[PDB]
Symmetry: C3
Subunit: 543 residues, 3 copies
């Protein structure tokens, strides 16, 4: 009939077989879930702290923590926008504690790092054109940003195996403490924007939600938990050490820039569009206003240090060895095409190598609009990279620079934006440039691991199915929750009770502004702890 004759004959007994077509439906523990939202207590210590107390005889267990934030209406003048995934960037520290002490705690960046592969959680935290594009206010009562609510998923080890991994409450008081980063960190604004009044008026409005469970005759057994510990190395130092490492499941290593020496102001920002090309295109777009000028006679409004050359009939302008081809259509007979040959320049010695941003352009084509009296650029051939877009304005106009540096117009310089994102990694905005040439992890005196390529990041990205991973050394390949995690055992007597991380940073040119971007080595260690439920919830470090 429907089944083929070759199949029926292949089947139509003497061996014991496991049933793959039916299963015994196990009766589970009698419970009832409920989404519970709580309003917290706001404190200033002058850091914003929100405390949420969970105490109920019927809330037997809980997991899936979601912190909601009410972002206010932003009215006034100037340019303003929120950082991508604003909600995650608001968080400085989170700590779930009982009367016996801290059960679990995470740093704001580490929670984000754990949620970087969760697209849904990142969207909920605030990732829209309404929130992340840089909006402009024209009148003191003009609405720059409309009020919005963001949802931050606080990923905890209690979510791993849903009900099985859930934090149990043996009639104990659980307090979730959320420490907030200053509003400066989550905002991208210009000089025109009245940040002084904004910082004063802004208040974090949080609300903690969780899936609560009412369990009838709960049978609680002890469990294991992984607690992260980050160690930040000294400025520009290629070393960091994690002390008292006794039982670790993993070890992550990454870099962070230190923009302390700068005013955190940058020439361009793409907004909601976060691709590498989007960052580059925004920078090229900002420079082009001053790079190619259509004026009657030499252009005015530029510093005396600026060297603006008229484009010859051949269209090619020679800035040293570099050739720039500039051809603009429909230019009035009374006007000429001009090129800024030193828009942004850097040097350490008077007659040495020069890093000129104008030299990074090979071809510029467009058409002059008589109606709008502005140039409309068609095709741009350049060698502008993600690093160029990531240079603070301070480094161009620094003491180390023998030249003026920023030879842009006053109009362009006014459009510069303050970026204080607390979760920037590497030396560029997209964390593209791998400044670690070699990594060395020493457990005591002996070398635990060494690599010349980011093969540990490659394994991290592959194993966790993440497109943005870190150089991570995983020690636990055992199933979580149902097994005691596999940890690196420490020998205190032999001095093997600390993890020392040493990197070999890539050498950069002294005449390139990015050389002066201070680096910081971050080392994260996931320590194993045992969750005991005898006389309340309590954790103990595995040693």
């Amino acid at each position: 009939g429907a089944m083929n004759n070759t199949i029926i004959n292949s089947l139509i007994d003497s061996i014991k077989r496991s049933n793959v077509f039916a299963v015994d439906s196990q009766i589970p523990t009698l419970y009832m879930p409920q989404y519970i939202s709580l309003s917290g207590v706001m404190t200033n210590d002058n850091q914003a702290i929100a405390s949420f107390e969970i105490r109920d005889q019927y809330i037997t267990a809980l997991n899936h923590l979601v912190l909601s934030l009410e972002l206010p209406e932003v009215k006034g003048m100037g340019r303003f926008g929120y950082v991508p995934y604003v909600g995650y960037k608001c968080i400085n520290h989170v700590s779930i504690s009982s009367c016996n002490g801290v059960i679990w705690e995470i740093e704001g960046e580490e929670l984000y790092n754990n949620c970087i592969n969760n697209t849904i959680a990142l969207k909920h935290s605030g990732y829209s054109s309404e929130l992340n594009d840089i909006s402009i206010g024209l009148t003191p009562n003009d609405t720059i940003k409309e009020p919005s609510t963001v949802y931050v998923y606080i990923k905890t080890p209690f979510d791993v195996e849903d009900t099985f991994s859930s934090l149990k409450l043996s009639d104990s008081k659980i307090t979730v403490t959320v420490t907030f980063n200053p509003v400066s960190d989550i905002v991208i604004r210009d000089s025109s924007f009245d940040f002084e009044t904004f910082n004063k008026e802004f208040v974090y409005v949080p609300e903690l939600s969780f899936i609560g469970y009412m369990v009838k005759n709960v049978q609680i057994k002890p469990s294991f938990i992984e607690k992260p510990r980050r160690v930040i190395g000294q400025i520009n130092q290629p070393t960091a050490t994690v002390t008292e490492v006794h039982a670790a499941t993993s070890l992550s290593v990454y870099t962070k820039p230190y923009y302390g020496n700068t005013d955190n102001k940058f020439i361009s920002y793409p907004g909601y569009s976060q691709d590498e090309k989007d960052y580059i295109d925004a920078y090229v777009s900002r420079l082009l206003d001053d790079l190619v000028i259509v004026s009657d006679g030499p252009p005015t409004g530029y510093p005396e240090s600026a060297e603006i050359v008229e484009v010859p009939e051949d269209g090619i302008v020679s800035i040293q060895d570099a050739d720039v081809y500039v051809k603009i259509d429909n230019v009035p007979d009374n006007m000429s095409v001009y090129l800024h040959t030193n828009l942004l320049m850097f040097g350490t010695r008077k007659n040495s190598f020069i890093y000129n941003i104008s030299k990074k352009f090979s071809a510029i084509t467009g058409t002059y609009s008589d109606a709008t009296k502005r140039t409309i650029f068609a095709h741009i051939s350049h060698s502008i990279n993600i690093i160029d877009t990531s240079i603070p304005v301070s480094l161009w106009t620094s003491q180390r620079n023998v030249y003026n540096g920023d030879n842009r117009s006053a109009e362009s310089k006014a459009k510069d934006l303050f970026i204080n994102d607390p979760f920037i990694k590497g030396i560029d905005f997209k964390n593209k440039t791998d400044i670690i040439s070699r990594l060395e992890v020493r457990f005591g005196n002996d070398v635990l691991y060494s690599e010349n390529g980011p093969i540990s990041r490659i394994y991290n990205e592959l194993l966790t199915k993440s497109n943005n991973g870190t150089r991570t050394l995983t020690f636990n390949f055992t199933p979580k929750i149902f097994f005691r995690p596999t940890t690196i055992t420490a020998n205190v007597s032999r001095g093997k009770d600390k993890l020392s991380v040493r990197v070999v940073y890539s050498t950069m040119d002294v005449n390139h502004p990015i050389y002066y971007v201070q680096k910081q080595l971050v080392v994260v260690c996931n320590d194993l702890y045992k969750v005991s439920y005898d006389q309340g919830v309590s954790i103990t470090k595995i040693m």
Copy 2:
């Protein structure tokens, strides 16, 4: 110390079976609605799962604009029911099957999601091919696929009939007035074929199982309440809104085609308006209603429509011609001295260049505040009785390009289901409040838990692993009157002078009831009470 082996495992010998992909041609019936019945009866088909319904879409020849709805295959389905001689084993509404498959990109692509199918193609001559014939595959996700062979529907000499009820072709087609739909509806016939993975099991040992059956309840038009009666054991409860376009002719100004992003919907609308928004003509433009206020753009370039300023600068405009702006392209007002919702006011800057060769304006950059809601307003609502103004001040040429959209699975008030119209949700089990929220936190949880971008306000009661465990359900007490689920929503406030305020709403409540699958004297399901 006793240790569990994590490096080796005893390879258990499974039940001796043989899978086979079986395709069946059904029986078409009509009354007034199309029905396809597929009978599965074979002594060797021991079990089955993974139902796939294929559809042969015909060649579309003639004149006018035509296109299929995205994921056309899923939109064709009105209802699906897997039944035995003892009765219905499982059944789902067309929309609910789509809702369950919205997170499956592969299943959505197979159902028909291409530029060849979803972009709006145009026919010029009565024998011009608008759309080429194509075959679409609709994955009928059933609870028998959850744990593959373990969850599969067992037969054993019993007859299984899969009944597929189809929505009218009107629902799956986007067309203009120029297209001869009358002839198309008459000529169109659904050509289905049901495929499934059949299993021939040697000495099958069948044990009873559990199944979740969805039940949707649709509220009255503009009623913020809906009640699901006889709830005894429910695994989940979903709540969402749907627009009712009965008061309209289902015609819309623009559609983006295959490109389905929010920006794509907006860009298509801006593109359609721009033809009438900025006019380059010798003297005042003609062909517009008397209600239209087309103002000549001054040397300054700025045209002031009340408080709103529009900057219009078009290059290479001939000396005999002038630049004009339609200051009231689309407007709405309940009263003569109320707020006015003007679409022309939603534009801040328009720049372009007039082409002498093609005698048309080529727009370069447009600065506007157009949203997804604007693109989702039916043309009928602009020209409604509530409007003291004309409403649609567009040209006859533009109005002719309007498209009929009858997608049966539209949610909320906009085409992208962006705008949340529920301000407060109240769920009652019997008469006592089971759940209440002021924020879409149940939806945020639904999206997080399912790893989905398009979720609903869902109340999940079952957090226990499926198939291997009896699902955790909300227990009912008939004596205490707790044998029903009543949903009440508070709709979000909007200004009466906005045309979207007049979009009729319908509250949809879906309840997943628990049933026990018994295999004694044939396949039969029993409601858990």
Copy 3:
């Protein structure tokens, strides 16, 4: 707080605890990422051998082969194929002293990793690697050196530590490489001769090694793929000695032996169907619409370049082309190449003209750059057009000249030798199989008129690029003995014969002349025995 309706609903029967679990102490082990430099050997194919022998290393899984791509300096156009790393691989074989434990063909490893976005990105998928870069001076850098990571997906990764290859024995991983010609897209201007001579594969094999204290090894099962390629254009292929098979995949591949592998256009990193079409349209437009003072020069005598009338419409037979270019100088006129690319087998029969595939062309002439800037193009160009090798236009079969493009355009043509191309087009869109018949022995096992098996393969594996696959194993892997198709040697039921029916094409269309190759992949079941070293045995 918990609602009053809930507390009353709760506040004899054996219940399984879903809120707490006994934390089982696992086998004492220690993982370590181990990287090894191999031994390079040399139709003089590159072979890399990696020997794994260590007393500490007890088991291994997750093989990742890294490759150091060198700096590419010189003149001309050059670029790497998308997912370059996977394309480099010709064959991989994990073997012991007892023989081959597991082996896969380069294409099959890629086919298994086509649904893994992370693994495909790591192998080399960037604008830096896949976009076609141009060198101007003999010392100009075309491509900067880069490292690519190829994830060698093996059955030892399925259930992590449980599925891992135990070697408590010397394990040798042998990686055979495809020639550099296969992984490179270049023009005639590029000195490939010197590049092929200078290029050397620089591999390094990484794996997650495990040091297990008192390992308890039990036997396991493994699926080994076997591909059979049919004779050129033959619609039949047979896989012999089929005794226990878990699956059977069937697909088509183009054979470009009769061609010089040169193509008119390539989109680079942008790999969408529209990207492939847009690149082709962009390349043709340079010669399709010409703005010149008098008739255009530099084209063959065979070319028919007609001046566009005041009306704007040029009639190439039944087909009408609307061409209107703005700001054209007073001394110049708009011209249209009416036979840019044409094909026919008879002098006065059907003509496949690429110029006929255009309905409207609009743009503006730039006086500054002296070139036309195209705004909107209305055409009927498909993925197949972009996939036609240049050889076929200028073939002996063609009565006409064929390639009526300028010498400038013809110079820009690129050699594409990608080893993992499927179907007849670059995006594997066109379905050329009309019917599929699979026979086990002499009896028909499966038959289909539609790609319902491909639909099931795509659905079940959650892949957007699947093949016509017959799966026999729906049983959980590693923890169960896989369900296989049983053979009957006496009845002569020990082979799988695949017969297809290709949908025939128009002989006046150049794509008809693209050679086909039927590919049939069979996954045979093998038993992994650990008695006196690692060894595999075919289930019969």
